[PDB]
Amino acid sequence: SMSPGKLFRQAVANEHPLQIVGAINAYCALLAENVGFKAIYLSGGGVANTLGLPDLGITDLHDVLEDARRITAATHLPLLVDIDTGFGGAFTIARAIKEMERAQVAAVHMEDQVAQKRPGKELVNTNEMVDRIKAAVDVKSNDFVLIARTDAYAVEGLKATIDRACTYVEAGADMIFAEALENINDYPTFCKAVKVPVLANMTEFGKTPLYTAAQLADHGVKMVLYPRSADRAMSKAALAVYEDIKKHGVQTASLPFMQTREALYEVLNYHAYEDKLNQLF
Amino acid sequence: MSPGKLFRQAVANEHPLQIVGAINAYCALLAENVGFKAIYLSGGGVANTLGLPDLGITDLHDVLEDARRITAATHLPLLVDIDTGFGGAFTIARAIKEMERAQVAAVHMEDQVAQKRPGKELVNTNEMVDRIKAAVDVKSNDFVLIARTDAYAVEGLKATIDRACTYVEAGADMIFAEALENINDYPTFCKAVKVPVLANMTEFGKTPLYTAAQLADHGVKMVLYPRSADRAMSKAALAVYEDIKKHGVQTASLPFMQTREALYEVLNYHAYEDKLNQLF
Amino acid sequence: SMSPGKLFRQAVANEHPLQIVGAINAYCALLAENVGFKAIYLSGGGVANTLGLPDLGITDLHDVLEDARRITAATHLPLLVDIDTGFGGAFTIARAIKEMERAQVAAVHMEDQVAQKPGKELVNTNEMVDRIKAAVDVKSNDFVLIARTDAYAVEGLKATIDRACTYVEAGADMIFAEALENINDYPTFCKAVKVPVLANMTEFGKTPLYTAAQLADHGVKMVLYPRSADRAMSKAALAVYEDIKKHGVQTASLPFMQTREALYEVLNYHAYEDKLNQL
């Protein structure tokens, strides 16, 4: 009935806050949907790492687009997709926006880091990020959600970050991704300043400490992101199975840690396929 | 050495060769890290990951894409599940050629009917020979065609051996003996078909779990663990999702997560920081 | 702010008849758009032949889907896409419909030939109904399913009309009447299967060439030109190759080439220099 963008907007409005969980593939998206999340996330780092590449902007529009298409094919849950810095200049960004819309994506986030390579965290000038934003806004539909992400806190401090975010909003950004604020009591100031919904990145093993969804909502945050949480647990679990099989010559020890065949069928809605398989035959 | 040759060598040198399923490039790296000599792309995995049932709904491209991603990331010989060959003789030929181009080492193709009274229905022996011929006619020498027979459950051991033998005569390099229920069937079966035999040690099936050693002792050359890792990943993911949902934070899941440090190790990340300083 | 399906439906209603021209790629689609066509077509034979494969249903959903995506990315002109027999069973068909919708396609045509095999074999009417139901069950309202029948050559006009009518009852939006040999068959056929009918005006076929006007007069709503441009392109390409080979330079081919200026026009290149200064 509603467009993906509209669904996302509605989820951000109704939830306090909206928890957005990362899913690396369609099946994970279904698991998340099953647990009752209202929005899901495609991590740029996830897309890269899953290919066995580092999160260094090596991936392009197609790497991400393919992963996004697979997910949106399997669920109507609004998906937020990480488009890094926009994969190139103004034309690439425009293409990215159009392609993500076509792929039934709800929202993207684009950040103000530098792209290019022939000192780690370097940002573009505010003006350049505005250029990026304008390129995106000029071709985007109304419903579709552009989240501008700023990486400025660690480098430039709270005031400079708020300044950027505000300029980004004026440039047409729908929502703001505030990367790695260190003090919970910075959020109320930040949220009040930028007016639009704010996303907080609750990734593990970062510089940021872990706050609860409730805590962050209390400090004015509208969205909480869990970008790699599931992926990290999956990787450990997979490694464990591999090690078990290798060391023991059989997977007996891994059996309690595996999802049952029954649960798999449930998630796939498998019985609905056997119903139509007999109704025609 | 070519991918096919590497697979052949792994089958010769290991007793037996354990082949573990990996759904994506990263899993393949984890498997490589643990020291496995061959990896596997599960057809059911390809489908289920897309959120589809394992009913031959996927086509050459669904599988090919997943295969390309893996072979891009590791030289470990990959066995790829091509179901029934995705169509007629021309489709099969295309599948073989594309998998070769994608640096795949081996495929397995089975003798079930395509998309079919519920059960397992098999094609006539002759039809499977046709499928095999289509594949063999375009395959290079090194590349490995494993013919898979699903006949045990339906037709019993003797009929299954008959098929497998015909498949070998039709040009099949190796045999995938699906769901033999008794360990003591293997020695008869392996001796009969002469070529290397793969046993499918999937969990939660009709088959019970035997060890690699046990199966090697009964004449088996390859043991397949098609979905083992995937199943554990799915449970772990669900747990994280449930934790975050119930508690509003992932604190409780933290002990169950791979460290950022281990991630960098697997990605060989330090090799990238080397070029990041050499240029600047 | 109309959906692709709605745009196609509107084009079929307003044109007498709607000419639908085949384009093998996005650029051809733009050329067609430029000339002023109201709908475009992605030929299954085109998709295959361009890959260097014969039109024998070797291609799958992805081969076609990729080519379709490229086109719809470049124009809003409603695109009709050939999905052969649906690429497999009921689940594959459902997937095909959903994926084509997602790819911003306006309409598909699916036919009643067998997948497996000097002649055409058809599926039983019931099997084609099954195919149609699979498609209809997941399709949106606006999206257009054209059922194609290959029955004329094999079974004759009456049997073909019977099938087409059953197909319409099964949920088909429109009918593709493949290879009717006589213009005077159409009025009977169109009146019988009350939905819009497409006529396939391919060259070098069994069918003779009638005009759009002639076919409209005989009750036809859509005329398809599936490979017309492609065939001319192939000859032109071969000619250039031969020129370069024989003469060591392409001087002789120059009058037969599109100017760089025209290329920029079609690509709307000036609109890119506009954004290059606006930022």
Added chain:
Amino acid sequence: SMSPGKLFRQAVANEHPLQIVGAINAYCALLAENVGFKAIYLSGGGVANTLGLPDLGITDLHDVLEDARRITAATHLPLLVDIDTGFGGAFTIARAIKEMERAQVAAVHMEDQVAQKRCGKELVNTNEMVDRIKAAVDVKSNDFVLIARTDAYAVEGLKATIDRACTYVEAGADMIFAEALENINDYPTFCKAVKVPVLANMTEFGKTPLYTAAQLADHGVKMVLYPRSADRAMSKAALAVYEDIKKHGVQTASLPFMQTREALYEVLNYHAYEDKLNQL
């Protein structure tokens, strides 16, 4: 038997010169093969324009890779692929090289223009192009051919261009693409200087005038490229058909300009498929 790179190298050695013709798709490649060309070319501008995009480095590795795969799937004729500036930094370039190799490509050309610029044409510093080249060379196999392309003539003049090209060769470039030399008598100096095979770009409607293959070979050129010749003729022919159908309500007038159904079957080697259609 021989690798794509080796085949290309052999074609460059044996032909005087090697004409390399652009083909936008697999079918065009077959037509070119049919006419008897020894090498074919995938134009970056072609890849973009066919999608309806301008040749402004908007396309990425995947846009080009897909088009390349389609072609190499259909013919073993060595394909030269335009990879623009390498689609990004050193890691992207490495990926591009590896992926093109995997896609059975014979050769790529990478140029010394900037990727993103200002707000006629800007080049990177020599050092940056060396960096690009090193990234490519470090992961490329021996057989595979890297052609370094310099766009420096128009901007910086012949001597500066020769200097660059020579540095590029020292950095590991196999061959040199000398874009838009305006005077035939520049080539002998240029070719002698940069001792490796040189490609001349005989595109129409450029700044360059049209010389013959023979003429260019006489001036020391090893390869002549015809990047968009076929494409341009195709576009005009297509437009004509569209206009005919639109204006006349039938395609009668276009019929003499169309390839016969018979010729199509010949090119597709269709009789080989009817052979298997009766063997089954």
